[PDB]
Amino acid sequence: ASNFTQFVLVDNGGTGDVTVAPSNFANGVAEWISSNSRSQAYKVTCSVRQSSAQNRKYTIKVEVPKVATQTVGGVELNVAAWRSYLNMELTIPIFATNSDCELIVKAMQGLLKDGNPIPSAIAANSGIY
Amino acid sequence: ASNFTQFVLVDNGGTGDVTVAPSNFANGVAEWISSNSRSQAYKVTCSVRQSSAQNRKYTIKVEVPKVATQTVGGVELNVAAWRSYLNMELTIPIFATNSDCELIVKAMQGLLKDGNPIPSAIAANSGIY
Amino acid sequence: ASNFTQFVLVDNGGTGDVTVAPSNFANGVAEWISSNSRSQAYKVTCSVRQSSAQNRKYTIKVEVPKVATQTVGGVELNVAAWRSYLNMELTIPIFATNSDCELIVKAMQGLLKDGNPIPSAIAANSGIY
Amino acid sequence: ASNFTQFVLVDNGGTGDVTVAPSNFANGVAEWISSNSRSQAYKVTCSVRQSSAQNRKYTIKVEVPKVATQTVGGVELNVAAWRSYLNMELTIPIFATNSDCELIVKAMQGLLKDGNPIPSAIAANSGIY
Amino acid sequence: ASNFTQFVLVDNGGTGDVTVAPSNFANGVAEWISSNSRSQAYKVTCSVRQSSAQNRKYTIKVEVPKVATQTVGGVELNVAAWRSYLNMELTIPIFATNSDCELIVKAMQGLLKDGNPIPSAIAANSGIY
Amino acid sequence: ASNFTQFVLVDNGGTGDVTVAPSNFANGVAEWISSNSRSQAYKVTCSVRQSSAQNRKYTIKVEVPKVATQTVGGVELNVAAWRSYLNMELTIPIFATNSDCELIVKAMQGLLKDGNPIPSAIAANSGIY
């Protein structure tokens, strides 16, 4: 069994989906990268570690690139004009049962569901109002 | 119009849903709290700010409590045995158009979709393997 | 194939079986945990390393907990009264054929079969005599 | 009881079984050895001591000869190339009742049951994957 | 994908082929091994890491047993006299697209194609002349 | 005979084949280059040396360029945007028979055959998983 597999990061219908695939798992940091030029690739990393005697802590990171071509002196390269960086830390006490964790996951999914405040603000270059 | 409204944080079917409602918007920090004892309430906060000349940065935070009763000297109070803390920062360059942002949101939703690596690990008190 | 699978650690004959499942592979240490909070879980880990120029060494560990509900600060926490620890190190020369290795497995199985000296002593809080 | 008796270490189904028998009890350390030269014998030793104020520790050791291409009764100067060494240390808290200890034994039996991850890895000269 | 599968390392035309199979994935380093003692096995390992700000590096290693006069399952203390070691490091700039990488693979295939200089030299215990 | 011959490094099926030819043997390093300016050429080198008293070591290197036309100082120069580098070191004991060496060649060919794990990963900007 393995959960270190490829998955769909961006569900753009069924065509133009960004799939991210495993690439390296060094030093306890799982890393996934989308295909093609590493320079324009999406990146996701995840690591879990015991932060204190009572808590475990997950550190997830995602990079969404803005695909572009750079032309310097007539030489064109595939690059990322810029990147957005998502950095999240999740602390969970060791007393949390599997049920408790499922709830935590649902809270995260709910937080970002379409239509809700946070995702609507982000999607529209806006804050709360 | 307002996006500073109540929303469903945990979609537990249609019964036992955790709804979170606005409570305070001081100093540019929007805050939502679930009903009943503040001590056992779920909490979500969000603020956006220009981090540099080129980037805007969102800071979202969620607290999932473990509901419990504390009995000290015969006096019982509603408290949270412990809390899980989600802390996420999202940096987005000012060149990002609305389309670019929608993609960013989809990446976040994809990252946490049921079945995918990260949420499956968290839900099962596990790391990547 | 993939030998990283779930298995039943304690066979109580279908009813109340302690089954353990893959939970982490960070740093080259395969880990399996029972379906409990991290504070009350059975835990098994295994790792292999080339200890010398001519040996390989498997380090296997198991934690059998005694679950309890402790009242800390007036709050009830799911905890472990104590844990029993098994620690085994197996050193196998590189010249060992697959059939040579099956011999080791059979020897370990025979060592612990019901009725044999060692498991009888352990199960009776007794020594060998 | 009087559990210090001969037993079948390797069960090859009646024909070609390896039986190991009492051979030493110096210092309360029970030793069992197969019927071979000491450089080619199967050896098992066991002893218990209270390791600390709250724990008892069983130290079990097993030595298994490399059989492929073995020359029975021959002299092989590099003995380490022809033997595998198993070292088991079982720590059991003094509160453990007999039932608790039976469960611990079952856990050990489950860990090594045929078909499960650990023994399959060992038998195939492999790690976990 | 899920390219971590068994494959034919040495193709002797169906009869007497050497198949190598997954045997370890510790630290994201994939390992494949043939069905032999570790002193006589064919071994292949592979891993990728971003070696610098602008490059990614694939490190591939292959070990091949000396077969002439080999004593199957035997103990040979000077292991180095019985194995050949191949070390490949492939550095690919992050700008390389999938097509660029296909070409790189073709170059490697061409380099080693039967009848070409390099492989003929190796196969004849020779240098270039 | 003379194994220092031209060969096709990249077989694009007759049309657009990258053929490489002998270009230097100074200092005991056999070199082959494609028919291009030294700034845009594919390059292959090989050398053999008795690395130790009992080993021989082949050092083979390949450079796959990405050709481009850069405008420097208003003038257009035929140049290389980047280069991919392959570096392989093969250590073969002196006891290796010719048939033993053919085994190594076949193993290297099998390693890179179309469809097998390693070349699939490389060609997809992916790791093994």
Curated annotation (Swiss-Prot), chains A, B, C, D, E, F:
It holds the Pfam family Levi_coat. One of its GO terms (biological process) is regulation of translation. Residues 31-104 are annotated as: Viral RNA-binding. It comes from the Viruses. InterPro entries: Levivir_coat, Phage_RNA-type_capsid. One of its GO terms (molecular function) is RNA binding. Keywords: Capsid protein, RNA-binding, T=3 icosahedral capsid protein, Translation regulation, Virion. This is Capsid protein.
